Amino acid sequence: VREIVHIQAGQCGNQIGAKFWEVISDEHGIDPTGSYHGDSDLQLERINVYYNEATGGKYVPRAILVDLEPGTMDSVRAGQFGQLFRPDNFVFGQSGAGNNWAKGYYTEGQELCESILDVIRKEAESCDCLQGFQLVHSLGGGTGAGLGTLLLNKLREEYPDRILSTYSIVPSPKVSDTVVEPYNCTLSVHQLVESADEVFCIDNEALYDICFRTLKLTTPTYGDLNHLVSMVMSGTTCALRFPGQLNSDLRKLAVNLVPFPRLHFFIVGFAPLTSRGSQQYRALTVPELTSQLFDNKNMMAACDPRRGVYLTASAHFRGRMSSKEVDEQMLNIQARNTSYFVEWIPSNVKSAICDIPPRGLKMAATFIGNTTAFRELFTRVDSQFQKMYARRAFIHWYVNEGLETVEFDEARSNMTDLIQEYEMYET
Amino acid sequence: KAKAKSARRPTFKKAGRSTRASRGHTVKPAPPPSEAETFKMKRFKNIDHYKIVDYW
Amino acid sequence: KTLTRGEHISAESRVDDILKGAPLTSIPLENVNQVIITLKERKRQATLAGNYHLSQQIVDLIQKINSIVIQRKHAQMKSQEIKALEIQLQQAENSLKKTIEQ
Amino acid sequence: MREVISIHVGQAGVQIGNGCWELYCLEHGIQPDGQLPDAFNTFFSETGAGKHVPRAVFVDLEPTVVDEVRTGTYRQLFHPEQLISGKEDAANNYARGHYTVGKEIIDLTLDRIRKLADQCTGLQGFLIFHSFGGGTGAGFGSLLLERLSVDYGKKSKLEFTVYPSPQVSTAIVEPYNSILATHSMIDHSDCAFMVDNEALYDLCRRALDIERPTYTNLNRLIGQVVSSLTASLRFDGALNVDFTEFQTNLVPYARIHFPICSYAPVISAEKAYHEQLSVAEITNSLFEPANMMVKCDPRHGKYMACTLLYRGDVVPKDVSAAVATIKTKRTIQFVDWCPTGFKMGINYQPPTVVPGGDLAKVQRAVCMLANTTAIAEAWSRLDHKFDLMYAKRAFVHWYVGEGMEEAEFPEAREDLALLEKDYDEVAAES
Amino acid sequence: LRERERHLVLTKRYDEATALHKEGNKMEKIEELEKKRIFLQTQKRQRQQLL
Numbered sequence A: 001v002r003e004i005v006h007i008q009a010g011q012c013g014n015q016i017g018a019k020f021w022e023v024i025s026d027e028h029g030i031d032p033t034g035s036y037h038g039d040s041d042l043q044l045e046r047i048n049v050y051y052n053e054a055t056g057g058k059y060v061p062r063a064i065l066v067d068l069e070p071g072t073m074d075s076v077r078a079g080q081f082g083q084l085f086r087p088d089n090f091v092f093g094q095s096g097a098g099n100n101w102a103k104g105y106y107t108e109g110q111e112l113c114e115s116i117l118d119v120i121r122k123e124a125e126s127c128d129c130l131q132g133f134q135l136v137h138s139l140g141g142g143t144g145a146g147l148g149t150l151l152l153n154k155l156r157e158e159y160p161d162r163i164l165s166t167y168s169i170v171p172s173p174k175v176s177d178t179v180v181e182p183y184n185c186t187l188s189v190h191q192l193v194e195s196a197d198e199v200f201c202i203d204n205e206a207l208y209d210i211c212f213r214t215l216k217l218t219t220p221t222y223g224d225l226n227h228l229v230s231m232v233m234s235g236t237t238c239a240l241r242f243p244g245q246l247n248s249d250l251r252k253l254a255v256n257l258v259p260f261p262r263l264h265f266f267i268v269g270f271a272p273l274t275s276r277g278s279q280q281y282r283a284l285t286v287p288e289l290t291s292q293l294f295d296n297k298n299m300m301a302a303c304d305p306r307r308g309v310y311l312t313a314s315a316h317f318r319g320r321m322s323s324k325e326v327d328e329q330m331l332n333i334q335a336r337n338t339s340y341f342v343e344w345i346p347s348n349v350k351s352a353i354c355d356i357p358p359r360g361l362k363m364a365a366t367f368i369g370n371t372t373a374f375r376e377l378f379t380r381v382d383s384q385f386q387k388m389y390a391r392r393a394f395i396h397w398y399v400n401e402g403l404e405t406v407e408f409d410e411a412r413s414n415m416t417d418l419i420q421e422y423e424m425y426e427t
Numbered sequence B: 001k002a003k004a005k006s007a008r009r010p011t012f013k014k015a016g017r018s019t020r021a022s023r024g025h026t027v028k029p030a031p032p033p034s035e036a037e038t039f040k041m042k043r044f045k046n047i048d049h050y051k052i053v054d055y056w
Numbered sequence C: 001k002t003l004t005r006g007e008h009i010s011a012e013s014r015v016d017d018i019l020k021g022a023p024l025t026s027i028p029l030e031n032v033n034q035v036i037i038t039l040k041e042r043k044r045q046a047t048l049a050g051n052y053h054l055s056q057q058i059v060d061l062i063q064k065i066n067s068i069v070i071q072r073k074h075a076q077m078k079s080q081e082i083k084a085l086e087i088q089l090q091q092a093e094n095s096l097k098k099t100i101e102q
Numbered sequence D: 001m002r003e004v005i006s007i008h009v010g011q012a013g014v015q016i017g018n019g020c021w022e023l024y025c026l027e028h029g030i031q032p033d034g035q036l037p038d039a040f041n042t043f044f045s046e047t048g049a050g051k052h053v054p055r056a057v058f059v060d061l062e063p064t065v066v067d068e069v070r071t072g073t074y075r076q077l078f079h080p081e082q083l084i085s086g087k088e089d090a091a092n093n094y095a096r097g098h099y100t101v102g103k104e105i106i107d108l109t110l111d112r113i114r115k116l117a118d119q120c121t122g123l124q125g126f127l128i129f130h131s132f133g134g135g136t137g138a139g140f141g142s143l144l145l146e147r148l149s150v151d152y153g154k155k156s157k158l159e160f161t162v163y164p165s166p167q168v169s170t171a172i173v174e175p176y177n178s179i180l181a182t183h184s185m186i187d188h189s190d191c192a193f194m195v196d197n198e199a200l201y202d203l204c205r206r207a208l209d210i211e212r213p214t215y216t217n218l219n220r221l222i223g224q225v226v227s228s229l230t231a232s233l234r235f236d237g238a239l240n241v242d243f244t245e246f247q248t249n250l251v252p253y254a255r256i257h258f259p260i261c262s263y264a265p266v267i268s269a270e271k272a273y274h275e276q277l278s279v280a281e282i283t284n285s286l287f288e289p290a291n292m293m294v295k296c297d298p299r300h301g302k303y304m305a306c307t308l309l310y311r312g313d314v315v316p317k318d319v320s321a322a323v324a325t326i327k328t329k330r331t332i333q334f335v336d337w338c339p340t341g342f343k344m345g346i347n348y349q350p351p352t353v354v355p356g357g358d359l360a361k362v363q364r365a366v367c368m369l370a371n372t373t374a375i376a377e378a379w380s381r382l383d384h385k386f387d388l389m390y391a392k393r394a395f396v397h398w399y400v401g402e403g404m405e406e407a408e409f410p411e412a413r414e415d416l417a418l419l420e421k422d423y424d425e426v427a428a429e430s
Numbered sequence E: 001l002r003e004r005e006r007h008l009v010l011t012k013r014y015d016e017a018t019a020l021h022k023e024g025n026k027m028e029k030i031e032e033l034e035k036k037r038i039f040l041q042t043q044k045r046q047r048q049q050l051l
């Protein structure tokens, strides 16, 4: 009874969210039509977190799907789980996305804002309690970055106390799908720094790299790339849904990992990952899990921690396992690499254990950490934005919507200060 | 160099130290009661005597 | 905490006046630390003699002075907003008519 | 007759509850449903027919841990109103669990403890379990002890808490809550016990033979110590020890009360057949640093008082010989202003075994509770760790936003320094 | 009463601490008078007993 409301924004959020609902529906044994056909009484203990109950034993997820063009939504309907969602939670416009941040924020976002908010109010005030909301969007696009940030501000004004956890995809440095990305990423960062409590950054390059290195997938499509992201989302809320030896929900994570209000951008990683042919030759144990998690290659964000230093880190474990063995590893990885931790905070590594593992896996672990290595990510976008901003004519696409040019200077200034702030704590 | 010292004040770029999210989370103490809750009209509020004979 | 005698004399004289309840704005902002710290000693002295009633009164004075000081700080914040934005707005006000002139 | 009331706070407290009450029910012989297939009335109440109910209250601010008891096997034994669960946990925040959420549920618990006290003709004390690092364990536990201090006054409020491990940690904010909780404990607690997880892991692997433990195995070790502690109130013995005798003999000063705990023999069911385990042998095992449940070396400091409890075929003559010998060694230092230093308690009931347990069917055992200046080693570590994080103001924003004024941070720091001064002043000699 | 009054003062609950101090002094006066009487009764007896 710590209900969480799910929000999916844009072409990226809908396709990530759609795969995400397949994972939990399998975890809790929910049939695609919405009826429970499971195998254990444990799965019905606290299923209220994500699903609502209708007459006749049907469960409806606490989800809202948001887009500006109907093309993405009709793909969700045709899916095997299309009939699962409540039809009134499908909110769409009738205009092109435009792939523009200002147009999504100001022109079409205002019209969709009131319609979306009242739908959220139906879900928000339908449950006995509400821990926080959950948002999935991309930062290189126009709807997820433009409209998503607008909804993030309105959610904060009405529900200040609740945890606004967001999962975001950061534009890639080498090759990316869009030209105007540097404007979209910079302007959205202004809104994300002050509004959201927690932000997780994921880069598509690492998901490609991890799949080629580890899973040995020759041609991974977005289906398997999204699957890695859905495990991280499932792992963080696992303490809410299942019992365990030591429980740790979202608000515990925010307290431990966030030392200062603005430094809350996080990196994520998941273990164990093994090639689907090599699983027989690998004795998966507790020391083996930590070997992957603290290995830099398993980061889903292309920001090598070794070039920076850690501030705080947290690990979630699932499955019946030794509490001594979990604690002993956390000692050693902190002690063996003392050159990569801040001296003025001892015991930088948080731990927690949950009883029930995901299907097929006897035990698994999840990593969330905060480090100065984010400076590499923001340097690339700021330098590219600087190159683009002097060529003022691309701004003309944003001026024709109502965006003042000073907003560019404001957006870069706060982004520049965050880079300095993440640098200043290295002393 | 004195200008350099004046530029970097001893705060050392601890920007935005109270963010919008933290201002949402902080607990706000109770305010004074609303006027309607206090309301009783004057003459009855001013009454002095009673019908119970507690004297001798 | 070994507050100096010069601060103690000035603060306690106002502390004596504050304990009469009449002063509302007589607080010196730079000397507010001395007044509160002086009340701490008077709080400790009151407790030692069973005068818990005066101890709570000193507590009420502590919150009264602090709360009103915040309101004096609150007026400072809004004065900053009007003054700063008016100068920024003047840049746009001048440009509007000059755009017509050009 | 003579009675105690058990109060459990937090995830550690409730999980310890299952560990201890499983032992009490099995040792007394009551089935999980409350029937039978004596000292019964110290821990259980009778309702007529043949039904018994524990004299305890379980408290937490999140429903997951409690509902495992409510759905578990032992669900019928406990009475529904005793199990109290909040809405959202303290999120490892002292201020949250003390001012905002703590005060949302504090007054509901105070009725159930007082109502449970009406069935107490001869109440002589409470037992309270914490985990210092947690939010509710420190925040709500501090608020609970402050109220019980004025509600009942001169009634022994014993505590049995888990001190933070010297290096092993599960929460980064652990130093903040441990120091803040200490100020509330010292003035109001009659006596508070410390154990730490890191020492138990080493003891549960070396002496007891387990490669990898869980929290369940640790809870049973604590269950044995508490059972020995209360055995004097329940069963016949040549030398009983009431709660009040325990309070006066151990604490030399008002604020120095903090003891440390040890148990012997702890030995696997396989190797236990190999030794006779005389009174002298088991007594010598307690005094080694390796058997200590708190990872502070007694040799760094001095001993202030000691108490030994014996549960088995233990004769008074051979107790005196063993305690005489340990006095002759010069590795156990004593402050020379405490020449006697001991209270001995003897009970006849041998330790009880548990199915699926880790210990053996031992015919004599000894429990030890002593106050040492070596615990000042533990306070120094916590004080230094808090200083580094507070110097750069690493987490203050979370606590201040939840109702706590910043002035409490130096007040708690100053009060701990005074306690450190007290321990060093006690260690002085004349 | 004076043990519970200590914690009321120490918890910074001063309004309720005033009430117990009022009852504490009242309960002293009744008890102070009694032991004065008993001592005077015993003191008077001893000189009679010795005489």
Ligand SMILES: Nc1nc2c(ncn2[C@@H]2O[C@H](COP(=O)(O)OP(=O)(O)OP(=O)(O)O)[C@@H](O)[C@H]2O)c(=O)[nH]1
Residues within 6 Å of the ligand: A245, A246, A247, D009, D010, D011, D012, D013, D015, D016, D060, D061, D089, D090, D091, D092, D093, D131, D133, D134, D135, D136, D137, D138, D162, D169, D170, D171, D197, D215, D216, D218, D219
């Ligand atoms: N020895 C032992 N320690 C435990 C056990 N369970 C929890 N702990 C300790 O408890 C600490 C974490 O605090 P919690 O267990 O959550 O206790 P709490 O007071 O309820 O804290 P909140 O859940 O935030 O309200 C861990 O660091 C453990 O050391 C247990 O079963 N045995």
Ligand SMILES: Nc1nc2c(ncn2[C@@H]2O[C@H](COP(=O)(O)OP(=O)(O)O)[C@@H](O)[C@H]2O)c(=O)[nH]1
Residues within 6 Å of the ligand: A009, A010, A011, A012, A015, A016, A097, A099, A137, A138, A139, A140, A141, A142, A143, A144, A145, A169, A176, A177, A178, A204, A222, A223, A225, A226
């Ligand atoms: N990880 C992942 N990324 C996707 C998926 N579909 C699209 N994307 C990426 O999301 C980025 C932004 O998509 P876009 O159509 O602009 O979404 P918008 O926010 O609604 O504008 C593009 O660079 C796509 O490559 C998916 O299924 N998974």
Ligand SMILES: [Mg+2]
Residues within 6 Å of the ligand: D010, D011, D060, D061, D062, D089, D090, D134, D135, D136, D137
């Ligand atoms: Mg708890």
